[PDB]
Amino acid sequence: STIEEQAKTFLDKFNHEAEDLFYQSSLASWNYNTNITEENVQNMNNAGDKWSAFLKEQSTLAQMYPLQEIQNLTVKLQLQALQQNGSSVLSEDKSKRLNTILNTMSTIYSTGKVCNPDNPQECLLLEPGLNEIMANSLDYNERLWAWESWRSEVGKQLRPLYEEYVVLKNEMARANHYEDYGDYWRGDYEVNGVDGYDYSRGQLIEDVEHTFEEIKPLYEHLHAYVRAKLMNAYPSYISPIGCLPAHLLGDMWGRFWTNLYSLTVPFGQKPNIDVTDAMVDQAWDAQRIFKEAEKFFVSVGLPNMTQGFWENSMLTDPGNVQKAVCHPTAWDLGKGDFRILMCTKVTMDDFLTAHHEMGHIQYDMAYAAQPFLLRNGANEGFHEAVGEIMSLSAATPKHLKSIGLLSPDFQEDNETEINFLLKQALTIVGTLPFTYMLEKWRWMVFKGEIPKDQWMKKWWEMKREIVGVVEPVPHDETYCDPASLFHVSNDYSFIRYYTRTLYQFQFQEALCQAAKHEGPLHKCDISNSTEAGQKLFNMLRLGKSEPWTLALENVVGAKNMNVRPLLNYFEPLFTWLKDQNKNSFVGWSTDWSPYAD
Amino acid sequence: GEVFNATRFASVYAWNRKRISNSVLYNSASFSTFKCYGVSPTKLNDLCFTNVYADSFVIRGDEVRQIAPGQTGKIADYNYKLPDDFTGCVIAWNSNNLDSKVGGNYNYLYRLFRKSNLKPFERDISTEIYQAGSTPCNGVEGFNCYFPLQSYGFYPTNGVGYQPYRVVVLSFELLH
Ligand SMILES: *[C@@H]1O[C@H](CO)[C@@H](O)[C@H](O)[C@H]1NC(C)=O
Ligand SMILES: [Cl-]
Numbered sequence A: 001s002t003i004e005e006q007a008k009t010f011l012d013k014f015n016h017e018a019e020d021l022f023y024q025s026s027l028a029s030w031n032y033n034t035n036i037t038e039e040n041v042q043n044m045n046n047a048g049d050k051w052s053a054f055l056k057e058q059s060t061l062a063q064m065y066p067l068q069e070i071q072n073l074t075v076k077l078q079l080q081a082l083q084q085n086g087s088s089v090l091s092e093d094k095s096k097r098l099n100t101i102l103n104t105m106s107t108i109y110s111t112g113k114v115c116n117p118d119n120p121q122e123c124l125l126l127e128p129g130l131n132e133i134m135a136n137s138l139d140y141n142e143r144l145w146a147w148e149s150w151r152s153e154v155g156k157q158l159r160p161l162y163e164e165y166v167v168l169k170n171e172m173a174r175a176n177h178y179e180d181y182g183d184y185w186r187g188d189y190e191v192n193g194v195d196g197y198d199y200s201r202g203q204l205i206e207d208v209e210h211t212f213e214e215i216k217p218l219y220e221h222l223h224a225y226v227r228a229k230l231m232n233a234y235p236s237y238i239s240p241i242g243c244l245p246a247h248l249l250g251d252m253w254g255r256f257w258t259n260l261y262s263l264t265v266p267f268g269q270k271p272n273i274d275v276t277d278a279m280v281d282q283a284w285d286a287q288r289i290f291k292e293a294e295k296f297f298v299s300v301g302l303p304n305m306t307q308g309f310w311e312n313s314m315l316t317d318p319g320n321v322q323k324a325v326c327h328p329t330a331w332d333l334g335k336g337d338f339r340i341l342m343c344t345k346v347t348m349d350d351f352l353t354a355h356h357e358m359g360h361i362q363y364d365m366a367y368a369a370q371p372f373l374l375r376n377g378a379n380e381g382f383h384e385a386v387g388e389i390m391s392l393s394a395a396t397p398k399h400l401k402s403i404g405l406l407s408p409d410f411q412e413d414n415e416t417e418i419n420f421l422l423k424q425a426l427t428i429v430g431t432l433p434f435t436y437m438l439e440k441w442r443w444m445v446f447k448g449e450i451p452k453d454q455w456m457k458k459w460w461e462m463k464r465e466i467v468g469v470v471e472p473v474p475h476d477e478t479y480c481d482p483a484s485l486f487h488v489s490n491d492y493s494f495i496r497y498y499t500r501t502l503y504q505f506q507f508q509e510a511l512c513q514a515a516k517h518e519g520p521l522h523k524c525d526i527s528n529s530t531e532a533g534q535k536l537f538n539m540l541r542l543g544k545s546e547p548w549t550l551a552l553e554n555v556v557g558a559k560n561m562n563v564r565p566l567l568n569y570f571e572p573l574f575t576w577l578k579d580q581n582k583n584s585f586v587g588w589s590t591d592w593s594p595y596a597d
Numbered sequence B: 001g002e003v004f005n006a007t008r009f010a011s012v013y014a015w016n017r018k019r020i021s022n023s024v025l026y027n028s029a030s031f032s033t034f035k036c037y038g039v040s041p042t043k044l045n046d047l048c049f050t051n052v053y054a055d056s057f058v059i060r061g062d063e064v065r066q067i068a069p070g071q072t073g074k075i076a077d078y079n080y081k082l083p084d085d086f087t088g089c090v091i092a093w094n095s096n097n098l099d100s101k102v103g104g105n106y107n108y109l110y111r112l113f114r115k116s117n118l119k120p121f122e123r124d125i126s127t128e129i130y131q132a133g134s135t136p137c138n139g140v141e142g143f144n145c146y147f148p149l150q151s152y153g154f155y156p157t158n159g160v161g162y163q164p165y166r167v168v169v170l171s172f173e174l175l176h
């Protein structure tokens, strides 16, 4: 009789029907991704459209049960996930237009090219033409052209669309009783109605801003050390007190300084810890890799992979007759089916990646006994955080010694340790001010704190102050540079990349703590530690059925994000950087620019 | 040999009884479950009984746990219930090789909703629409009106907990 009992019944019907349709879509999507044919792609679209239509219909029926009259929270959660209105609450005219913008912006980024001035027939797309230049060119002017011509040709197209995109999204969020579309985005961390686990939407701002303050020292000393090393590669163009030219950072945006290792490697003449040679010399294959990965998770008390995995997963390239999609994926088809799609090759990067993707299966398996709507990470950051720590332990020479890929006569000198630690920081801590600043911009744009006639100004004002990066060419409001990045033009939240990183190292400290690890946090291997496995398992089993605060607290013992584990991981590099910067300015000035002279 | 080797079994909600009365069964070792609740298997073959009934059906791997006295859930409350004083044996084995096809075998069904729980050894095959709301259904599906039976989808790639299992339940009169 009660609405909660009715909702209980509706979800009971959903969960059984949804599990089947999803498994149908999963099977078809699998066939395409393993054998790209016109037949299998037509099945993938039909199965998807069926699953989608079902999902839309259920969402409309789900709203007929008001969650204002439901007390069971694991039911109120499931209903909340179904009756997400989205752009349904907007007028049918505006909704039609908003989708036209979204599909237009996506296709400008993906199907937009710029031809070089020297040869008007050889035109280049962002992928692979422009990204190859930004990731391999050492010429200041070649880099400058690609960086500028992308932001001027493609970016200016996206400017009038992103202005319309901001207005319509904000109407969609105010109609959904949010304050702005950025507040809507911060809902993915909200928790309400649980004593001591509530997490407001505005809280995510305070935490990110205060937790970033404690990264500022390490970043400055990294940034100082990179601007130093970059002055050797690009001599005349960089000032030892000014920001870094945006087109010199290894990719199109400076999101990752990963590509700068070749120029910034501290001790270049020492080799990298690469057991790729040692594996091939023992005639390893993809089978042996995933066995060792399976063996790793069993060592902490997690189950070994189901026989379905070993029989159905794609673990090699299936010849040259049929083409797959080797982008490493970990499938959770449902109905107890778990698979990893990977064209594995005998290297170290794949050995690591295997441990990463199997960790995704481990998470997928542990909450498979949850209701269908609650089979997911505790929040957007949890899933990749789990997959990453499985590569941390597996990479250490401690672990490589355990399995026989490294001789017990190994020299772990402080130099290769810092070489590796620097490589890490370029990717991990390099992207942290980038990711923060990009989202903070959008957060003030959606809130109206940045007028349209100051978008590009306030953009570079913050790129200077926060990231320490400066434009090589001045940009008025005809430009739209943030829209030149995938995640912005394609309407995706970006703060997930900041939290995912901090979470990752929170897990790794708490696990290495339970694993009685002695030395620094960066040499830890949680293998053979059942106390760590259990401590991790008590979070994986939860899925998204409980607040992310509690799920985090099941691993680390605290109910909130923290950064000091990240700093602790990099603290040996922090000191080395502090010492090499005695003959260089630490920090930057927001006034020097290459164009003003 | 024709209640165990039958090339198709009955749906759990419409379970089939067939009177077996007319050790080598238990020494097969190919049975995944052989849980008796009256006397040990090696014994009953030399014990006094008048009536032996075999109730046979197919269910999910995870649901085999429910074919036992005192159990609760969808299969126990709504499909096939065993009494607390059950005297007999429960046999189950994996049937994925037979009851799951590449396209997906949707033939086997089960009862998902019912107004009340089945009494021991009761059977219900009614297809009358379940009414979850105050307003009556009058024999049409819709909002708060669900067709009570639902279909098992068995694929050869399904997980073990989702694979089909053939179940045979032996019931003994146990004269005294
Ligand atoms: C919500 O309903 C589920 C139904 O299985 C039940 O297990 C759970 O205890 C309920 N939560 C409550 C009553 O807080
Ligand atoms: Cl059935």
Ligand SMILES: [Zn+2]
Pocket (backbone or CB within 6 Å): A356, A357, A360, A384, A387
């Ligand atoms: Zn991943």
